[PDB]
Design a protein around this ligand. Structure first.
Ligand code: CDL
Ligand code: CDL
Ligand code: CDL
Ligand code: LPP
Ligand code: LPP
Ligand code: LPP
Ligand code: LPP
Ligand code: LMT
Ligand code: LMT
Ligand code: TRT
Ligand code: TRT
Ligand code: TRT
Lengths: 103, 55, 65, 53, 57, 114, 220, 52, 68, 56, 97, 56, 45, 52
C-alpha cells in the first residue's frame, strides 16, 4: 500500500505543516543573522569588537592581548597571500591624490 | 589559506593541573550518576517479576 | 478462481516490514559508532588560541585566499 | 501459519508479524502516514460499551 | 560576565547548531513516525456485522 | 456555545503524588540494613546526623551500578592534587621584579587593556 | 584588492554535538506527548490540532534533551547552550512564536488584512446603514479626508491589526530572558558560594575535609 | 514568596482533597514571586562585573 | 501537579506493549549481558607482572642512556 | 476605499498597494520626525566636474 | 513459501542488542566517562589551566625563550605559573572576574 | 592472612610467567586467539605503556 | 571558575569567506548557466 | 522564613493527621525563603574582602 512515509519525502513534507516549521525556523534564523550579525560582527571592518571586554568578555579565554595582536597578524598574512596571488604593487596606492568636492 | 600554526601545539601534562575542590567535585554531578544509574537499573529490572512458587 | 481484494505486490507498495525494521535500527547502530567518536573528538581536541598565540587557525572554505 | 513459527521458538519481528495481518497492516501504515499516534476515543465511539473502560 | 554580551545574541555557532539539528530532525522524521498503534487490530477483531438471515416463516 | 461536556477522569490529579511516594518508597526500601556491622557516629548531643543514615542507600545503589562505580571515582585524585598544589602555592617564593612587571590578573595593567 | 570583502566566521564543535541530540530522540520517544495532547485538547479543537501538537512536541523534547545533556553530558557546547541568550530566544522561543502562524497562518493573515479595513464590530448586526457605510465609505467610521494622511494610516492600521498578535512575541521574549537569567544567575551564585567556602577551608585545613560527605553533598 | 506556600498549607488544611488541584497554583505562585527577586539581583551583578 | 493521564501514560485507553523477545536456546544479548562473554582479565596476570617489570626496566635504561 | 473591502484578496491587494505607494513615505516621515529638530550640516552639493572622460 | 527476504534468527539476535537499549543505558554509561574526562573535571581543568600558565609564561619569561629552554625547566616554570594562578594573589584568592 | 598468602603466591606467579608466555606464543603462531585473550592482552599493553612512562 | 564554566572555548578555527569573490563567482555561474542554456529574457530562470 | 513554620504550625493545629504530608513543603519553603537572605548576604561579603 502506497505511503508518502516510505515513497515520497516531498509529498510527506507538503502534507504536514509541522514539517514546514523547522524549515521556516532555519530561514528566519539565517535571515536574522544576515540582517544583524553579519556586518556588525563577522565583517573584517567590524571584527575587532570581539576584543572588547564589555561586548565580548573573554572571547579568547582571557583579556585580549594587544601586544601580540593575533587578529592583525593573521589577517596581514592573508592579505599578503592575496597580494602575492594577484601580483599587485604595494606602493601604487601611495601615488594617489584624491581631489575634494569643492564649493 | 588553511593554516596549522605551532602556537596551538603546546606541552601537556596532568601534573600541571590545578584541579578541583571538594565542592566543585560534588557540583560536578558525578555522584548523582553514581547513585541514579543503579536506581534506574534496579527499577527497570525489578518491575519485571518472574514466576515463582510460594514456600 | 482467486479470493477478492488480493493481489501480488508491486514496487509502489513500498518496502516490506523487515526492511522497514532494518531501516529503523540503523541510527541505533550508528549510535555505537558516533558516541565513542564524540568522546574521542572531545578528548583529542586542542584549544585554538592562547595569550602567546601570534596566529589563529584559519580554514579557507572555498580556496579564495 | 505465523503462530506456527512462534511456537517453534523463532522470534518474529513486529513488522514481519504485521505483514501477516495485511488488512490491519494497510490501515496502520496509513495512520502512520497521517502522523496521529493517538487512540482510544475512536474505540469508545465505535464500541460505546467500552466507554470509560 | 561572559554570557552578558551582544556577541552571544546572534551567535552564528548556535545558529549552525540549530540548522544541523533541525536538518537531521527533518531527515529522521519518517523513523519517529514508525510506532504502531493497536486500534485497527481491535476494529478487525471486534467489528461484527449482523450475520442473521431473513426467515419469513 | 453551551457544549455540555462531562467531567473527564483522566484530567484529574489523584495519582501523581501517590506515584512519587511509590518511587520514594522504592528508593527507601533499599536503605534497609542489618544490625551486624552497624555503626553511626551520632552528634555530640547523641542525636543522629542528617546525611549519615542516608549513605547506606546511596552506596547500595552504587553496588548495583555497573560503570559509574568504576569510572566516577577517577576524578577524585584531582581533588588531592589541588589540595597539595594549593598548599605549595600559599607560600611559594617568587621574584619581586617579575611580580612587579607581570602580576597575574592585576587591575590597571595597560598591557591587558585596562 | 578592492572587490575582496572578507568576512570571518567563528566555527567550533557543532556537528558531533548536534547529531546526538537527534539520535537521542529515538530513546526519549516523545515522553511529553501525553501532556501536550491533554493541553492542546484543553485549549483548542480543530482539524489542525495534530500539526501544532507535533510542533510543540519537537520544541519541548529538544529543550528537555538539551537540558539533560547540560546537566549530565558536560562537554563543550552543552554547558554554555543553556547559559546563552541566543539559544533561549531563537532555539526555543522563536519556534513556539511562529508555530501558530505556521498552522493557522491562512486565517490569521486573512483576519489581519480584514482588520486593516478597520471597522466597529456589532453583535447581531441587523443594520442596513452599517452595510452602506461599510461598502460605500469602506468603514463604519467617517473616512473624510483621511487620504490626506494615508501615508501614516497604512502602517498605523497594520499595527492596529497585529496589536493583538504582539503580546505573544512579548511573552515569548520575556520568558526566554527569564529562563536565561535563571540559569545564569543561579549557576554563578552557586559557584561563587562554592569558591568562598573552598577559600575558607584552604585557609583552614582543619576544615579542608569531606565534612558533609563524598556522596551526601553531591546527591543533595 | 513564603506567603504562597503558607496559603497552600492552610488551604490544604481546610480541604486536603483539593491539595492536588492547588499545587500547580502553588508552584505557579513561587517561580513568579521568586523571579522579581532574581531581577532585583541582576542589576547589582550587572553593576560590578562589567562596569569598570 | 500533573494530570492522571500524564502519570498513567495514556489519555483514554492503555495501549498494549509488545513484550520482549527471548530467543530460546541461547543467552540474552543486551548491553548488560556482556560479562557472559567478556569477564575481567584473568589469564595473563603473571605475564602482566613480568612485562610491566621489563617495560619499566628497558624504558629506564634507554632514558638514562639518552639523558647521559 | 470600496475595493479594499471586496472579496478575492482585494483587502490584501489594497493594503499592500497603500503600503507600496504611501506607507514608504510614511515610514520615512516617522524616521524624520526625530531628525527635524536635530542640527544638521550643510549639503556638500556635487560640483558635477568629476566623471567626465573622453572615449577611446 | 514466504515471498519476502526472511532475516535469519542470528541476525535478529544481533539487531536486538542494538535496538533493546534504554535511555538510562545510554545516559549513565556514556555520561560517566564524559563527566570524568570532560570539560568539567579533567579536560576542563587541564585546558583552562594551560591558558593561565601560558599567559603567565609569556608575561614573565617569553614564549620564544620558553620554547628554547628544556622540557624539564619548561615544566618547572609551568608548575610555578600554575601555582601563581591557583593562588590568585591579586583576586584575593578567588577565581572570579 | 593476606601477607602469608601474598608471600606464598610468589612461586605460583613466577612459575606461571613462563607458562602464560608459552601459551601466548602458541596462540599467536597457531592464530587460536579469542576475544577474552585479546582483552587480556590489551589490558597488559595498557599497563605496560603506563610502566614505560614510569620507567622514562 | 564559575565564569570558566559559563565560557565556550570549544572553537576549532576561523572560516574566512570573501563574500565579494563569492558574489562574483555566483554572478559568473549565473552568466555561464544562461549562456549555456541560451535562455531568453522572458524565461522564469 | 518564620512565616513557613508558622503556617505549618497552624496547619497541623487544624489537622494533625496531615502533618506528615505538609512537612516536605515546610522544609522546602524554609530553604527558599532562607536562600534569598543568603543571596543578599553574598553581595555584602563579596563587597568587602576582594574590592580595594
Ligand atoms: C511584489 C514583490 C514582493 C517580493 C518581496 C521580496 O522580498 O522579493 C525579493 C526577495 C529577495 O530579494 P533581495 O534579497 O532584496 O535581492 C537580492 C537577491 O535575492 C539576490 O539573490 P539572487 O537574485 O542571486 O537569487 C535569485 C533566485 C535564485 O534562486 C535559486 O538559486 C534557487 C536555488 O531566487 C533567490 O535566490 C531567492 C531570493 C534570495 C534568497 C531569499 C531572500 C534573501 C533575504 C535575506 C537573507 C535570508 C537568508 C535565507 C536563507 C535561506 C536558507 C538557505 O526574493 C524572495 O525572497 C522571493 C522571490 C520569489 C520570486 C517569485 C516571483 C514569481 C512571480 C510569478
Ligand atoms: C580510584 C582513585 C580513588 C582515589 C584514591 C586516592 C589517590 C591519591 C592520589 C594522590 C595524587 C596527588 C598526590 C600528590 C602528587 C603531586 C604530583 C605533582 O604533580 O606535583 C609534583 C611535585 C612537585 O613539587 P615541587 O614544588 O616541584 O617540589 C618538589 C621537590 O621538593 C623538589 O622538586 P623536584 O622535581 O626536584 O623533586 C625532588 C624529588 C623529591 O626529593 C626527595 O626528597 C627524594 C626522596 C624521594 C624518593 C624516595 C624513593 C625511595 C622511597 C623508599 C622506598 C621504601 C621501600 C623499599 C623497601 C623497604 C623494605 C623494608 O622528587 C621526587 O622524587 C618525586 C616523588 C616521586 C616518587 C618517588 C620516586 C620514584 C620515581 C620513579 C617512579 C617509581 C615507581 C614506583 C612504583 C609505583 C607503583 C605505583 O612533586 C611531588 O609531588 C613530590 C612531593 C611528594 C609526593 C606527594 C606526597 C603527598 C604530600 C605529603 C604526604 C601526604 C600523604 C602521605 C600518606 C601517608
Ligand atoms: C598499591 C596501589 C593500589 C593498592 C590497592 C589498589 C589495588 O591493588 O587494586 C588492584 C589493582 C587492579 O588489579 P590488577 O588487575 O592486578 O592490576 C594489575 C597490576 O597493576 C599489575 O601490576 P602487579 O601488581 O601485578 O605487579 C607489578 C609490579 C611491577 O614491578 C616493577 O617493576 C616496579 C618496580 C618498582 C621499584 O609491581 C609490584 O608488584 C610491586 C612493586 C610496587 C608496585 O591493581 C593495582 O592497582 C596495584 C598495582 C598498581 C601499580 C601502579 C598504580 C599506579
Ligand atoms: C492624490 C490625488 C487624489 C485626488 C482627489 O480627489 O483627492 C480626494 C481626497 C479627498 O477625498 P474624500 O473627501 O472623499 O476623503 O483629497 C485628499 O485627501 C487630499 C489629496 C491632496 C490634494 C492636493 C492638495
Ligand atoms: C573498554 C570496554 C569496557 C570493558 C568492560 C568489560 C565488560 O564486558 O563489561 C562488564 C563490566 C562489569 O562486569 P560484571 O558483570 O562482572 O559486574 O561492565 C558492565 O557490566 C557494562 C560495561 C558497558 C560498557 C561496554 C563497552
Ligand atoms: C567546504 C568545507 C571546507 C573545510 O575543509 O572546512 C572544514 C571545517 C573544519 O575545520 P576545523 O575542524 O579544523 O576547524 O568545517 C567547516 O568549515 C564546515 C562549516 C559548516 C558550517 C557552514 C555550512
Ligand atoms: C545550486 C548550485 C549552485 C552551484 O553549483 O554554483 C557553482 C558555483 C561554482 O563557482 P566556482 O567555479 O568559483 O567554484 O558556486 C559558486 O559560485 C558559489 C555558490 C554559493 C556557495 C555558498 C553557499 C552559501 C551562500 C554564500 C555565498 C554568497 C551568496 C551567493 C548566492 C547563493
Ligand atoms: C529546592 C532547592 C531550592 C534552592 C535553590 C538553590 C539554587 C539551585 C540552582 C541550581 C542550578 C545551578 O546549576 C548548576 O550550577 C553549577 C554550579 O556552577 C554547575 O556546576 C558546574 O560548575 C561548577 C562551578 O564551579 C563546577 O565546579 C562543577 O564541576 C560543574 O558541574 C552545574 O552544572 C549546574 O547545573
Ligand atoms: C513538582 C513541582 C511541579 C513541577 C511538576 C512537573 C515536573 C516535571 C518534570 C518531571 C518529568 C517526568 O517526566 C516523566 O517522563 C516519563 C518518561 O520517562 C513519562 O513516562 C511515561 O511514558 C512512558 C513511555 O514513554 C510510559 O512507559 C510511562 O508509563 C509514562 O509514565 C512520565 O509520565 C513523565 O512524568
Ligand atoms: C527520583 O526521585 C526520587 C529520589 O528520592 C530521594 C529522596 O531522598 C531522601 C532519601 O534519603 C534518606 C533519608 C532518610 C532515610 C532513613 C534514614 C529513612 C531513616 C531510617 C532508616 C532511620 C528509618 C533514608 C534515606
Ligand atoms: C567488552 O565487550 C566488548 C565486545 O563484546 C563482544 C560481545 O560479543 C558477544 C557476541 O554474541 C554472540 C555470541 C555468539 C554468536 C553465534 C553466531 C556465534 C552463536 C550461534 C552459533 C549459537 C548462533 C553470535 C553473537
Ligand atoms: C529527582 O529525580 C532525579 C533523577 O533524575 C535523573 C535524570 O536522569 C535522566 C533520565 O533518566 C531516565 C532514564 C530512563 C527513564 C525510563 C526508564 C523511564 C525511560 C523509558 C520511558 C524509555 C522506559 C527515565 C529517566
Amino acid at each position: 500500500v502506497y505511503t508518502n512515509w516510505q515513497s515520497s519525502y516531498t509529498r510527506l513534507f507538503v502534507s504536514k505543516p509541522w514539517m514546514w516549521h523547522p524549515l521556516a525556523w532555519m530561514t528566519l534564523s539565517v535571515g536574522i543573522w544576515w540582517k544583524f550579525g553579519k556586518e556588525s560582527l563577522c565583517n573584517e571592518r567590524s571584527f575587532y569588537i570581539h576584543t572588547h571586554p564589555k561586548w565580548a568578555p573573554h572571547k579568547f579565554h582571557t583579556v585580549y592581548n594587544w601586544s601580540r595582536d593575533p587578529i592583525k597578524w593573521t589577517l596581514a598574512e592573508q592579505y599578503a597571500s592575496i597580494i602575492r596571488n594577484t601580483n599587485t604593487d604595494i606602493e601604487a596606492v601611495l601615488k594617489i591624490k584624491l581631489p575634494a568636492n569643492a564649493n | 589559506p588553511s593554516t596549522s600554526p605551532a602556537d596551538k601545539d603546546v606541552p601537556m601534562s596532568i601534573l600541571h593541573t590545578h584541579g578541583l575542590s571538594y565542592v566543585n567535585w560534588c557540583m560536578s554531578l558525578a555522584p548523582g550518576l553514581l547513585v541514579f544509574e543503579g536506581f534506574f537499573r534496579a527499577r527497570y529490572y525489578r518491575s519485571r517479576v518472574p514466576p515463582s512458587r510460594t514456600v | 478462481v482467486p479470493v477478492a481484494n488480493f493481489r501480488p505486490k508491486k514496487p509502489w507498495d513500498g518496502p516490506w516490514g523487515i526492511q522497514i525494521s532494518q531501516k529503523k535500527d540503523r541510527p541505533f547502530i550508528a549510535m555505537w559508532i558516533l558516541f565513542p567518536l564524540l568522546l574521542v573528538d572531545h578528548l583529542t581536541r586542542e584549544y585554538y588560541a592562547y595569550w602567546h598565540s601570534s596566529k589563529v587557525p584559519v580554514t579557507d572554505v572555498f580556496g579564495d585566499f | 501459519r505465523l503462530h506456527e513459527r512462534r511456537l517453534r521458538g523463532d522470534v518474529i519481528d513486529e513488522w514481519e508479524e504485521l505483514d501477516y495481518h495485511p488488512l490491519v497492516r494497510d490501515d496502520t501504515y496509513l495512520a502512520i502516514d497521517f502522523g496521529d499516534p493517538t487512540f482510544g476515543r475512536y474505540i469508545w465511539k465505535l464500541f460505546p460499551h467500552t466507554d470509560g473502560d | 560576565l561572559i554570557p552578558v554580551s551582544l556577541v552571544d545574541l546572534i551567535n552564528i555557532n548556535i545558529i549552525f547548531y540549530i540548522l544541523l539539528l533541525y536538518t537531521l530532525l527533518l531527515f529522521f522524521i519518517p523513523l519517529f513516525l514508525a510506532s504502531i498503534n493497536y486500534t485497527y487490530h481491535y476494529i478487525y477483531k471486534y467489528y461484527n456485522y449482523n450475520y442473521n438471515f431473513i426467515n419469513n416463516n | 456555545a453551551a457544549p455540555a461536556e462531562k467531567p473527564d477522569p483522566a484530567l484529574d490529579a489523584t495519582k501523581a503524588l501517590p506515584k512519587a511516594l511509590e518511587e520514594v518508597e522504592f528508593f527507601q526500601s533499599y536503605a534497609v540494613r542489618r544490625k551486624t556491622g552497624f555503626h553511626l557516629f551520632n552528634r555530640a548531643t547523641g542525636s543522629p546526623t542528617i546525611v549519615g543514615p542516608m549513605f547506606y542507600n546511596l552506596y547500595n545503589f552504587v553496588r548495583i551500578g555497573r560503570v559509574s562505580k568504576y569510572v566516577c571515582w577517577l576524578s577524585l585524585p584531582l581533588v588531592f592534587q589541588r589540595m597539595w598544589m594549593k598548599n605549595r602555592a600559599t607560600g611559594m617564593e617568587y621574584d619581586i621584579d617579575l611580580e612587579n612587571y607581570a602580576p597575574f590578573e592585576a587591575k590597571k595593567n595597560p598591557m591587558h587593556g585596562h | 584588492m578592492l572587490n575582496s570583502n572578507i568576512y570571518i566566521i567563528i566555527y567550533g564543535g557543532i556537528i558531533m554535538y548536534s547529531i546526538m541530540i537527534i539520535i537521542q530522540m529515538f530513546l526519549y520517544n516523545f515522553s511529553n506527548k501525553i501532556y501536550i495532547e491533554v493541553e492542546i485538547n484543553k485549549y483548542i479543537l480543530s482539524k489542525n490540532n495534530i500539526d501544532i501538537y507535533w510542533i510543540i512536541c519537537n520544541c519541548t523534547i529538544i529543550i528537555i534533551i538539551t537540558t539533560l545533556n547540560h546537566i549530565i553530558n558536560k562537554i563543550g557546547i552543552y554547558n554554555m547552550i543553556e547559559y546563552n541568550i541566543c539559544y533561549w530566544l531563537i532555539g526555543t522561543g522563536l519556534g513556539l512564536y511562529i508555530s501558530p502562524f505556521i498552522v493557522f497562518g491562512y486565517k490569521f493573515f486573512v483576519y489581519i488584512m480584514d482588520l486593516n479595513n478597520y471597522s466597529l464590530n456589532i453583535y447581531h448586526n441587523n443594520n442596513k446603514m452599517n452595510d452602506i457605510q461599510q461598502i460605500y465609505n469602506g468603514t463604519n467610521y467617517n473616512d473624510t479626508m483621511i487620504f490626506f494622511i494615508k501615508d501614516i494610516n497604512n502602517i498605523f492600521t497594520i499595527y492596529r491589526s497585529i496589536n493583538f498578535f504582539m503580546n505573544w512575541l512579548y511573552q515569548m521574549i520575556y520568558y526566554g530572558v527569564r529562563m536565561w537569567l535563571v540559569f545564569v544567575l543561579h549557576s554563578f551564585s552557586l559557584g561563587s558560594f562554592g569558591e568562598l567556602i573552598t577559600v575558607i577551608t584552604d585557609n583552614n585545613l582543619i576544615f579542608n575535609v569531606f565534612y558533609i560527605g563524598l556522596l551526601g553533598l553531591g546527591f543533595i | 514568596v513564603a506567603m504562597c506556600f503558607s496559603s497552600y498549607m492552610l488551604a490544604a488544611a481546610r480541604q486536603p482533597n483539593m491539595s492536588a488541584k492547588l499545587l500547580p497554583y502553588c508552584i505557579l505562585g513561587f517561580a513568579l514571586s521568586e523571579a522579581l527577586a532574581l531581577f532585583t539581583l541582576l542589576i547589582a551583578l550587572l553593576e560590578l562585573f562589567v562596569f569598570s | 501537579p500533573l494530570p492522571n493521564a500524564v502519570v498513567q501514560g495514556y489519555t483514554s485507553v492503555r495501549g498494549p506493549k509488545r513484550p520482549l523477545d527471548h530467543f530460546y536456546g541461547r543467552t540474552p544479548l543486551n548491553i548488560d549481558t556482556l560479562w557472559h562473554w567478556v569477564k575481567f582479565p584473568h589469564r595473563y596476570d603473571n605475564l602482566r607482572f613480568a612485562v610491566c617489570f621489563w617495560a619499566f626496566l628497558v624504558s629506564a635504561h634507554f632514558a638514562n642512556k639518552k639523558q647521559r | 476605499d470600496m475595493m479594499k473591502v471586496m472579496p478575492g484578496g482585494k483587502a490584501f491587494v489594497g493594503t499592500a498597494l497603500g503600503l507600496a505607494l504611501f506607507g514608504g513615505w510614511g515610514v520615512e516621515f516617522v524616521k524624520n520626525i526625530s531628525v527635524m529638530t536635530k542640527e544638521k550640516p550643510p549639503i556638500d552639493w556635487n560640483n558635477e566636474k568629476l566623471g567626465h572622460l573622453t572615449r577611446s | 513459501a514466504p515471498l519476502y527476504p526472511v532475516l535469519s534468527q542470528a541476525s535478529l539476535y544481533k539487531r536486538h542488542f542494538f535496538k533493546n537499549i534504554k535511555l538510562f543505558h545510554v545516559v549513565f554509561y556514556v555520561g560517566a566517562p564524559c563527566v570524568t574526562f570532560g570539560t568539567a573535571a579533567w579536560s576542563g581543568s587541564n585546558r583552562n589551566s594551560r591558558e593561565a600558565i601560558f599567559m603567565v609564561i609569556e608575561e614573565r619569561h617569553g614564549w620564544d625563550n620558553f620554547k628554547k629552554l628544556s622540557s624539564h625547566q619548561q615544566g618547572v616554570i609551568m608548575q610555578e605559573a600554575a601555582q601563581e594562578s591557583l593562588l590568585a594573589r591579586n583576586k584575593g584568592e578567588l577565581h572570579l572576574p | 592472612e593476606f601477607w602469608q598468602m601474598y608471600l606464598a603466591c610468589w612461586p605460583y606467579r613466577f612459575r606461571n610467567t613462563v607458562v602464560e608466555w608459552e601459551t601466548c606464543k602458541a596462540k599467536v603462531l597457531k592464530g587460536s586467539v579469542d576475544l577474552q585473550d585479546i582483552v587480556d592482552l590489551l589490558y597488559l599493553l595498557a599497563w605496560a605503556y603506563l610502566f614505560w612512562i614510569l620507567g622514562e | 571558575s564559575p565564569n570558566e564554566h559559563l565560557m565556550f572555548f570549544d572553537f576549532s578555527s576561523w572560516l574566512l569567506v570573501d563574500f565579494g569573490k563569492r558574489w562574483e563567482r555566483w554572478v559568473s555561474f549565473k552568466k555561464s548557466f544562461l549562456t549555456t542554456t541560451r535562455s531568453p529574457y522572458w524565461s522564469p530562470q
